[PDB]
Write a protein that binds this ligand. Structure first.
Ligand SMILES: [Mg+2]
Ligand SMILES: [Mg+2]
Ligand SMILES: [Mg+2]
Ligand SMILES: [Mg+2]
Ligand SMILES: [Mg+2]
Ligand SMILES: [Mg+2]
Ligand SMILES: [Mg+2]
Ligand SMILES: [Mg+2]
Ligand SMILES: [Mg+2]
Lengths: 48, 108, 46, 237
RNA sequence: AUGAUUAAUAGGGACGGUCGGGGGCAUCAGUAUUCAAUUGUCAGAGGUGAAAUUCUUGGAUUUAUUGAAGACUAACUACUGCGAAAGCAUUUGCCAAGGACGUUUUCAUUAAUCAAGAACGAAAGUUAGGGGAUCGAAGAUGAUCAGAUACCGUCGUAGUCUUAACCAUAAACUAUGCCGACUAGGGAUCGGGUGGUGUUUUUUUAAUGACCCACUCGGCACCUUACGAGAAAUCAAAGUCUUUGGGUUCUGGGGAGUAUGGUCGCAAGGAACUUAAAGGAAUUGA
């Protein structure tokens, strides 16, 4: 206990935070997969 | 601070916020600093709530940064108890003094 | 309820032998068993 | 403590009588900013009337937010110091003296889980104006990053610092201060630092934190008038 | 010029690109403290739980433009990094050093533990110079009112800094000898390397990054469990299938008092007497 419980709390929060971030990336990649599945001046400047 | 506590600033006209750091009281580093924060909060936050109830204030303990919301006389009373905890006073001794001042607060 | 566990601070039997100016180990008999038998008898004669 | 119970002090014995209101003798003066800024009117100041008034005026420094001078909140967090150099008919002609950020903005950018990169260079303009520039940058995490932090190795930091010093030195040397101030307002310097240091490591919140004026050459009224863009009197009878 | 075998997931050396708040010498910056110059205004400023010394109408405190001195590197700062430990956070350059990684390079037992014997060793402290801003043992002084604020305020010696030597002590901690082998799962991070992939990239100046996934060495750590251990707290070691042999160094056999046929130490100096007592108290009594 003491200081050691507090340090445990921080690591668990970071671990929980990482899970949320990773799930967001997986969700986004699924959207990209679905998206992939489904003026003269501007064309001259499309490369920029 | 909690929203309902923050509303007190709108409702009343004589509530202020006092702010200070742990390093201002004493140069604590490493585990010594972390233990000091735990001493202010106490187990389950009981020490922080004891100060809040006794002095009629609200305290936010953001790492080494302490903010106290309440009346001018009240926040000074809360500040002294917090500072004693930082200097090393055990929570039990601070709790006793809180009971003494808490008694005085009612009679007046 | 504030309790702090006490600090444990740190003359061996060997040093007791050398406490005198001389080394007590260096003045001993060859047969201690014979000595004890003879001391007890001589004490009774005295 | 003005109470009667307060113990008497030695200094209370003899006190000068207040017999003149100082603002009776003060005279108001209007401060004008260089042409590099959109809003020239930057307030007014006061001085004791000449018995001269100009001597107290010269060397006076006033600091004002860029938002007022440019009329846009995008510069709310940046302050510009202007120093009085010439006086003409209650108009105080001022020149650039320095630049700095508000403390609240500086504290906002500094955050945990990232590396703080700060670089400084002492360099002179083509006008022989010696000045010191401070730059600040922070690392950022990529779009697909999963690590909590975005720390950069000291090799990257030293590489980024070298690039920043080259850009700050290059622009100041190949420019006048009036030109240099013209660069500060649109923050083109920061965008240049971004692109140059980018391949080394992604960065965020790249800004020129502060500008100091260490030395000045001989004052030139002719140049000052050109920056601000003489008058006959009226017969008194 | 000429006799032997491996090349140990032993060791040493070499080479390659790295990595580091590792070290020494210079160098650059940053506000802050104190002081000083100029500047505007006028009665307080300071400090405490409350006050008093103290400073102040020759202008204190406060304001603005500067300068000088000596320290120190905030935020970034994290259960992250380096070093044998003590310790080490501004920039740039120089000097040498170093762990890990990569290697189809080299030597070939050169090793482990270590009486004897050697280098470094926080803070404080001793000798002799320098410096002396901040804080500050000692000393002086204000106040001695009130128990949550109950020891505070002002000046401040030695010291704090540095140069050349001494001192060698810390709760100098895993409160835990070293070397080697083996015995569980999990994913976070630092350094190196390998492969894939697609974003940020970008172009014959050159030069090489960031992120994601998988793997692999080395490291600071962490979480869940031990078919093991322990009385227990707990332990990936404090384990090695009922009682015991992988190698080697050191060490052992709490809190209060009582007395002493013992040992060693420890200073300075050249005159009472009253009635015992109502011989009293008293706004209160007789
Ligand atoms: Mg080999
Ligand atoms: Mg090498
Ligand atoms: Mg003044
Ligand atoms: Mg690091
Ligand atoms: Mg820094
Ligand atoms: Mg000395
Ligand atoms: Mg230590
Ligand atoms: Mg082992
Ligand atoms: Mg890796």
């Amino acid at each position: 206990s003491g200081l050691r419980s507090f340090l445990r709390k921080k690591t668990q929060n970071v671990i929980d935070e990482r899970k949320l971030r990773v799930q967001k990336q997986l969700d986004k990649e699924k959207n990209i997969r679905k998206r992939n599945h489904q003026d003269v001046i501007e064309e001259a400047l499309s490369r920029f | 601070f909690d929203l309902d506590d923050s509303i007190a600033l709108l409702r009343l006209d004589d509530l202020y916020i006092e702010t200070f750091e742990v390093k201002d009281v004493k140069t604590l580093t490493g585990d010594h600093l972390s233990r000091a924060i735990g001493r202010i909060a106490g187990k389950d936050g009981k020490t922080k709530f004891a100060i809040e109830n006794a002095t009629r204030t609200r305290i936010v303990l953001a790492d080494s940064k302490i903010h106290i919301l309440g009346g001018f006389t009240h926040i000074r009373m809360a500040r002294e108890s917090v500072v004693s905890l930082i200097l090393g006073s055990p929570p039990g001794k601070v709790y006793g003094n809180l009971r003494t001042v808490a008694s005085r607060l009612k009679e007046r | 309820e504030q309790s702090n566990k006490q600090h444990r601070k740190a003359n061996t039997a060997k040093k007791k032998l050398h406490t005198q100016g001389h080394n007590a180990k260096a003045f001993a008999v060859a047969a201690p068993g014979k000595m004890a038998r003879t001391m007890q008898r001589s004490s009774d004669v005295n | 403590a003005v109470g009667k119970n307060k113990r008497l002090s030695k200094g209370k014995k003899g006190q000068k009588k207040r017999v003149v209101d100082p603002f009776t003798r003060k005279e108001w003066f209007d401060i004008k900013a260089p042409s590099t800024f959109e809003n020239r009117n930057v307030g007014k100041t006061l001085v004791n009337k000449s018995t001269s008034a100009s001597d107290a005026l010269k060397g006076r420094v006033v600091e004002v937010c860029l938002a007022d001078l440019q009329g846009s909140e995008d510069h709310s967090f940046r302050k510009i110091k202007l120093r009085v150099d010439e006086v003409q008919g209650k108009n105080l002609l001022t020149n650039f003296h320095g630049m700095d950020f508000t403390t609240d903005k500086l504290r906002s950018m500094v955050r945990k889980w990232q590396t703080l990169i700060e670089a400084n260079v002492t360099v002179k303009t083509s006008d022989d104006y010696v000045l010191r520039i401070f730059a600040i940058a922070f690392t950022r995490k990529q779009a697909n990053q999963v690590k909590r932090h975005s720390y950069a190795q000291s090799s990257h930091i030293r590489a980024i610092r070298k690039v920043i010093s080259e850009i700050l030195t290059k622009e100041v040397q190949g420019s006048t201060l009036a030109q240099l101030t013209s660069k500060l307002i649109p923050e083109v310097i920061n965008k240049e630092i971004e692109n140059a240091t980018k391949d080394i490591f992604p960065l965020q919140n790249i800004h020129v934190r502060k500008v100091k004026l260490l030395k000045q050459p001989k004052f030139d009224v002719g140049a000052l008038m050109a920056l601000h863009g003489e008058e006959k009197g009226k017969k008194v009878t």
